[PDB]
Design an enzyme around this catalytic site. Structure first.
Site, PDB file in Angstrom:
ATOM      1  N   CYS A   1       0.792  -1.114   0.015  1.00 47.88           N
ATOM      2  CA  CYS A   1       0.049   0.101   0.060  1.00 47.88           C
ATOM      3  C   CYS A   1       0.918   1.072   0.195  1.00 47.88           C
ATOM      4  O   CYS A   1       0.900   2.096  -0.899  1.00 47.88           O
ATOM      5  CB  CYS A   1      -1.053   0.049   1.259  1.00 47.88           C
ATOM      6  SG  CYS A   1      -2.153   1.348   1.371  1.00 47.88           S
TER       7      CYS A   1
ATOM      8  N   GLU B   1       4.602   0.985   1.345  1.00 51.52           N
ATOM      9  CA  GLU B   1       5.735   0.682   2.181  1.00 51.52           C
ATOM     10  C   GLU B   1       6.830   0.782   1.005  1.00 51.52           C
ATOM     11  O   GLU B   1       6.844   0.965  -0.138  1.00 51.52           O
ATOM     12  CB  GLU B   1       5.583  -0.684   2.802  1.00 51.52           C
ATOM     13  CG  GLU B   1       4.823  -0.856   3.981  1.00 51.52           C
ATOM     14  CD  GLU B   1       3.563   0.042   4.068  1.00 51.52           C
ATOM     15  OE1 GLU B   1       2.543  -0.158   3.342  1.00 51.52           O
ATOM     16  OE2 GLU B   1       3.506   1.397   4.179  1.00 51.52           O
TER      17      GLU B   1
ATOM     18  N   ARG C   1       2.630   3.051  12.483  1.00 55.81           N
ATOM     19  CA  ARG C   1       2.288   3.146  11.253  1.00 55.81           C
ATOM     20  C   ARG C   1       0.818   3.372  11.134  1.00 55.81           C
ATOM     21  O   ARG C   1       0.143   2.675  11.904  1.00 55.81           O
ATOM     22  CB  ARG C   1       2.893   1.858  10.424  1.00 55.81           C
ATOM     23  CG  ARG C   1       3.079   2.267   8.724  1.00 55.81           C
ATOM     24  CD  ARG C   1       3.248   0.886   8.117  1.00 55.81           C
ATOM     25  NE  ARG C   1       2.178  -0.240   8.222  1.00 55.81           N
ATOM     26  CZ  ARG C   1       2.299  -1.187   7.566  1.00 55.81           C
ATOM     27  NH1 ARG C   1       3.466  -1.530   6.717  1.00 55.81           N
ATOM     28  NH2 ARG C   1       1.520  -2.169   7.705  1.00 55.81           N
TER      29      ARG C   1
END
Ligand code: NA
Ligand code: NA
EC number: 4.4.1.41
Lengths: 412, 412, 206
Positions: free
Chosen positions: A50, A52, A260
């Site tokens: 997505c 990273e 995150r």
């Protein structure tokens, strides 16, 4: 980034299919290099999944990481360590009757206790996962293609591979939900004393049925995503003391443990188990995802959302990874040449602010509701939901409404 | 220092020698600067007694009270904070000859709390603060760098000096750090034109337009201020090299263009300056320089007219270039070994977190936790590049001249 | 073990996994051997009640008191020290197949404080001590090393076993460690000839 290429990007955004997603070198490369990646390999990174960032001959960490429903810390603070969805089961800490708290300071410290209790258990769960995965998983093809696996003669899913950098994560779900709920209580219960804790609780217990004036008042308290420091400073401290814990876990585990905000579709099931919350969200509704504004709470335009992101971060620390950030624009606002230049300008600002990720959604509210009634006429409607491209007409109601209920910025 | 000393185990075989002498040194240097300051208080009292002009007599009496308090005790206001700064930078001059003359740090940051409190309480005006700062500059203007070694004198021709004063930049949290003082320094440099101080401004990707405008106005003024240093280059390099990001963001400009982290930097050796034009000439002259006749200084790379291809000529240049590099690195390593036998800096050390933690003087070679930023100087960059490019195009590519032709033209 | 466990930081990322499961195991294994010993105490009472002979009945009753105290609590005398030893070596056989069958250590050294005290206080004679040690040998002689794997059978044919008993040698301070018990072990081996125990003597220059 050259103007000619940024314009081509803006034109693709204008096409209205939700591409491309954007990842910001100026945030990613220094973080990954500071964390140990050689600068040339860090500059050579690939986007992965997505949001990273992978360095294919340097990255060595592969464990799927814990997802934390931090809205539970909020509800459990409002409910003596219980969640209504689970009845009387003690899930978190017994922080007591919330009407007893005399001061904001006391209330917030009890929030922190709940929040940190969840982090502590998440870090423990992840370390066990890290210890168990090498006993079940190997990847011989990925390893043969990996300089460090071949040099050390170790499979990629080994725990420690000399020379590697291990970027691990833990997910923060419900950021804006927590921030807005805390801001609403700070403002209206403790500072202005326009409401008692009991009244907010009774309204929440009713799913705001019969308490619409209290609901309206909670919703008008300061919200994240408007560049309002009243709320954004709460968001910043929450992100900060989360990273303080993460620094300790990193030391104890010997890897980077970084917060995150990449939700995938987890905010739907996480939202289903959470009752109404003090920001005015009703029971079972999706949590705020990523580091975006809570649904409809952002009323000051897209730049304000970027600035809330910037000011809620902690750039003098490093225990952060991606933030998933979505902003929906009305197509009238971005039409034609002038509209493409506006997209270009938003992108340059987001880059300067060192924000990790950006995704535009260019869709009118009428198009979306029209496609719910007459799917056959909108089978070409591609949108962005939970981070991935989908045909709107193939999406479930849970996710359709997720996208519909976001603010459509018109004045771009 | 006394408490660290009390915490030693002076019954064991080692602490009384390894640790106690350093802490005795620290106790003594604290006494030294406090003695020096208390002597200025009596002198101000005596100069007052002998002063009829009653406004000056009261100035001197305020000065005496100031010097009785700082730097032995915490500064209580902006006036005391500036005189403390002054005592430290002047005792630093007594301590040693730090290259360029001791630099002054982020004055707009560490003086701002004193400045803002005094303005708000009406004990200070912006005009009074500018006066005091400008007093600093006029007395700094009377301390001139005395180089006795001809090499130093010729490397710092004309009393060359760079007592950097840093304004602007970012906070340790990574947000813009501009404040009213930052503007005051720039106003003062336009209104009080002079070669003191070396005003240096930190720029970053989010420097506000209003501040960048004030900078541009100062540049327009035509006095050659301020110099500019780029956070976006400096901070990631220094952090990648091991400096914690919050301290890296908090850097001071030092000397000409250098970047110091006052509680992390530990390297202090003056570094080699390489005249790389000599590599060019020695390539043209079989390892000789005409200034030195037949003395073989570099490598015997042969008759230059014998080179048939640019590749063979460039490899020979590299041989000359790398031969100087190797000798420079060897020279610098020896310097690094000898300097700790000759130089110490007890005052700089007692103000250094790592010197105090490790109980080591700053000019020790290796201080655990420190980062050692060393240098070697490239002199003649454009000269070498343009010369090589000229020979590349005209001699080997376009064959419009022979090496022989070029030599005789230069020889003449 | 419980104290080590309370001293872990069970809020941190690692102790709950790296250290706590080991200390839990230790707590459990201590219960295991204690439970086993306690069931013997009750077996002795029930056997005593079913035994008409008055002398053996008292014997079985003293056995029950012994098995109630050791190995849960420190041995109070020679007889408790030996029965403690017996529980540890027998439970070691339940734990695993240590090669040669589990060995018995420096019996003349760690039993001597108990033996000297009971002798002096008149609760024990050397003949009674020798009888108790010989009771150990005759029940050790009924535990036979069973090798299923043919390699083990042919490397230890004939029920080969070496349950070493160490006597003599030096103390931890490097002086001779001979005591009255050292001699008692050698007397018993002569008087009561048998293939148990595997009596092994430490020799040194003094
Ligand atoms: Na791995
Ligand atoms: Na040093």
């Amino acid at each position: 980034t050259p103007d000619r290429f940024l314009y081509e990007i803006a034109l693709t955004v204008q096409d209205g299919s939700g591409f491309p997603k954007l990842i910001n070198d100026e945030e990613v490369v220094p973080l990954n290099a500071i964390k140990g990646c050689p600068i040339n390999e860090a500059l050579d990174y690939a986007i992965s999944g997505c949001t990273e960032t992978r360095m294919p001959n340097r990255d060595t960490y592969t464990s799927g990481c814990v997802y934390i429903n931090f809205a539970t810390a909020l509800e459990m603070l409002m409910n003596n360590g219980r969640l209504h969805y689970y009845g009387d089961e003690l899930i978190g800490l017994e922080t007591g009757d919330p009407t007893r708290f005399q001061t904001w300071e006391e209330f917030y410290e009890a929030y922190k206790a709940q929040h940190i209790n969840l982090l502590q258990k998440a870090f423990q769960q992840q370390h066990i996962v890290d210890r168990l995965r090498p006993q079940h998983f190997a990847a011989p093809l990925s390893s043969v293609l990996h300089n460090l696996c071949m040099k050390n003669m170790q499979d990629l899913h080994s725990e420690k591979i000399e020379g590697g950098v291990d970027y691990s994560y833990f997910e923060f779900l419900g950021y804006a939900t927590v921030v807005d709920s805390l801001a609403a209580i700070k403002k209206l219960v403790f500072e202005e004393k326009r409401l008692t804790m009991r009244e907010v609780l009774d309204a929440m217990n009713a799913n705001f049925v019969g308490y619409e004036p209290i609901q309206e008042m909670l919703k008008n308290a300061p919200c994240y995503g408007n560049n309002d420091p009243y709320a954004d400073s709460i968001a910043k401290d929450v992100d900060r003391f989360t990273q303080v814990e993460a620094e300790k876990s990193s030391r104890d585990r010997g890897i980077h443990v970084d917060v995150r905000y990449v939700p995938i579709t987890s905010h739907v099931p996480f939202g289903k188990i959470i009752a109404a919350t003090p920001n005015g969200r009703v029971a079972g509704f999706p949590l705020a995802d990523g580091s975006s504004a809570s649904h409809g709470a952002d009323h000051n335009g897209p730049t304000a959302v970027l600035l809330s992101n910037y000011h809620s971060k902690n750039y003098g620390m490093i225990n952060r990874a991606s933030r998933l950030l979505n902003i929906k624009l009305s197509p009238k606002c971005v039409a034609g040449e002038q509209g493409a230049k506006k997209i270009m300008s938003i992108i340059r600002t987001w880059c300067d602010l060192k924000l990790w990720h950006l995704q535009f959604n260019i869709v009118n509210r009428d198009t979306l509701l029209a496609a719910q009634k007459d799917p056959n006429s909108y089978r070409n409607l591609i949108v962005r939901v939970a981070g991935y491209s989908a045909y709107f007409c193939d999406m479930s109601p849970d996710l359709q409404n997720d996208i519909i209920d976001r603010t459509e910025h018109a004045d771009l | 220092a006394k408490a660290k000393l009390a915490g030693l185990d002076l019954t064991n075989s080692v602490d009384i020698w390894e640790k106690k002498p350093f802490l005795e040194a620290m106790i003594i240097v604290c006494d030294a600067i406090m003695i020096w300051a208390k002597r200025h208080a009596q002198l101000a009292r005596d100069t007052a007694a002998a002063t009829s002009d009653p406004v000056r007599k009261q100035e001197l009496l305020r000065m005496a009270d100031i010097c009785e308090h700082v730097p032995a005790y915490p500064a209580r206001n902006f006036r005391e904070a500036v005189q403390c700064q002054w005592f430290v930078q002047m005792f630093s001059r007594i301590e040693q000859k730090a290259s360029a003359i001791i630099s002054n740090g982020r004055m707009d940051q560490y003086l701002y709390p004193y400045y803002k409190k005094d303005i708000e309480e009406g004990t200070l005006t912006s005009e009074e603060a500018k006066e005091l700062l400008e007093c600093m500059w006029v007395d700094m203007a009377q301390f001139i760098d005395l180089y006795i070694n001809p090499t130093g004198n010729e490397f710092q021709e004309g009393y060359a000096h760079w007592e950097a004063v840093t304004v602007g930049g970012q906070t340790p949290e990574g947000e813009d750090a501009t404040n009213e003082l930052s503007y005051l320094f720039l106003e003062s440099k336009r209104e009080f034109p002079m070669t003191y101080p070396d005003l240096a401004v930190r720029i970053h990707s989010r420097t506000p337009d209003r501040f960048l405008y004030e900078i541009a106005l100062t540049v327009q003024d035509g006095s050659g201020f301020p110099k500019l240093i780029n956070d976006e280059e400096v901070v990631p390099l220094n952090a990648i090299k091991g400096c914690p990001i919050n301290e890296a963001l908090d850097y001071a400009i030092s000397g000409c263009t250098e970047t110091r982290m006052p509680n992390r930097d530990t390297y202090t050796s003056g570094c080699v300056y390489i005249n790389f034009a000599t590599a060019l000439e020695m390539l043209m002259n079989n390892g000789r320089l005409h200034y030195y006749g037949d003395e073989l200084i570099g490598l015997e790379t042969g008759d230059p007219t014998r080179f048939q291809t640019w590749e063979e000529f460039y490899e020979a240049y590299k041989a000359q270039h790398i031969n100087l590099l190797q000798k420079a690195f060897q020279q610098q390593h020896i310097v690094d070994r000898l300097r700790p036998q000759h130089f110490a800096a007890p005052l700089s050390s007692v103000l250094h977190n790592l010197c105090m933690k490790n109980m080591q003087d700053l000019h020790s070679e290796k201080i655990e936790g420190g980062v050692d930023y060393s240098y070697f100087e490239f002199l003649g960059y454009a000269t070498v590049v343009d010369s090589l490019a000229a020979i590349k195009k005209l001699v080997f590519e376009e064959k419009r001249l022979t090496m022989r032709e070029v030599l005789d033209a230069m020889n003449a």
